[PDB]
């Protein structure tokens, strides 16, 4: 069931995002702006198709996908990756693969907040999102 993830979510806490971005090769000026933005994430479904928007004053993205079906994605930092999103232990797990590299974007609901854990290399970033009414 993906339904408790659906809605509009606002960033309210971030840990180690600079380490994560630097692990991906994001340049210092982009990391600087991204360390101060607070994106809004919108997760919607229509039948079997999920759409995940990320909006901010700096970068915007949007992806649509079916759980368990690979899709091409061009990330906010301009990586061209092979992606798949699935539910695993009630967590929404997004795996990106490119050039033999991987990164995971794992979303979990804890006490009504959405916790996004971003892992690449040894870098582990935890970002916390609050639901907007
Ligand atoms: C798809 C997310 C980016 C669009 C809004 C991003 C503002 C900064 C936060 C998100 C990505 C950062 C943009 C700068 C390049 C780093 C991007 C690394 C992959 C995107 C991570 C998204 C993290 C977030 O959804 O909280
Ligand atoms: N098609 C691409 C996206 O795949 C890429 O992620 C994005 C970069 O982020 P932004 O749109 O904020 O420049 O540019 C375009 O929209």
């Amino acid at each position: 069931m993906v339904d408790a993830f659906l809605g509009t979510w606002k960033l309210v806490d971030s840990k180690n995002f600079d380490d994560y971005m630097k692990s991906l090769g994001v340049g210092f000026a982009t990391r600087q702006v991204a360390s101060m933005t607070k994106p809004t994430t919108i997760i919607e479904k229509n039948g079997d198709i999920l759409t995940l928007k990320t909006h901010s004053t700096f970068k915007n993205t949007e992806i649509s996908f079916k759980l368990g079906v690979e899709f091409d994605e061009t990330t906010a930092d301009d990586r061209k990756v092979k992606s798949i999103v699935t539910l695993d232990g009630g967590k929404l797990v997004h795996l990106q693969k490119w050039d033999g590299q991987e990164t995971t974007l794992v979303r979990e609901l804890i006490d009504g907040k959405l916790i996004l854990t971003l892992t690449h290399g040894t870098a582990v970033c935890t970002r916390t999102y609050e639901k907007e009414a």
Side-chain angles (χ1 to χ4, degrees), residues 2-133:
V2 71
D3 298 272
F5 290 99
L6 303 180
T8 298
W9 297 94
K10 174 59 186 26
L11 185 77
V12 299
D13 188 73
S14 186
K15 299 186 173 75
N16 300 341
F17 192 45
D18 182 74
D19 284 331
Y20 177 78
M21 289 187 287
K22 192 177 180 194
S23 189
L24 290 174
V26 177
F28 74 90
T30 296
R31 297 199 314 270
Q32 186 195 113
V33 178
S35 72
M36 290 298 285
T37 60
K38 299 185 185 180
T40 297
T41 303
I42 306 163
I43 312 178
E44 293 172 285
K45 78 183 185 179
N46 184 171
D48 300 331
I49 305 305
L50 289 160
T51 299
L52 191 153
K53 298 177 178 184
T54 309
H55 292 165
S56 79
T57 54
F58 182 32
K59 304 285 181 190
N60 294 314
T61 59
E62 179 173 317
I63 60 175
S64 293
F65 55 88
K66 181 175 292 190
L67 295 172
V69 179
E70 186 174 72
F71 59 104
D72 285 307
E73 176 183 11
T74 301
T75 66
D77 61 313
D78 298 310
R79 290 174 286 116
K80 292 184 180 177
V81 309
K82 301 283 165 186
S83 287
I84 192 165
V85 181
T86 191
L87 282 163
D88 181 350
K91 303 189 185 202
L92 187 70
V93 176
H94 179 178
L95 173 63
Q96 297 175 338
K97 290 196 288 176
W98 74 108
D99 294 328
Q101 301 195 235
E102 298 178 328
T103 186
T104 56
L105 307 86
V106 176
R107 294 179 171 91
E108 187 176 32
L109 300 165
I110 304 187
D111 296 325
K113 301 187 194 93
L114 186 162
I115 310 312
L116 170 62
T117 302
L118 299 174
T119 305
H120 177 253
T122 60
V124 182
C125 160
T126 308
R127 285 163 72 80
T128 302
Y129 281 85
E130 193 177 350
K131 204 161 198 240
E132 187 203 83

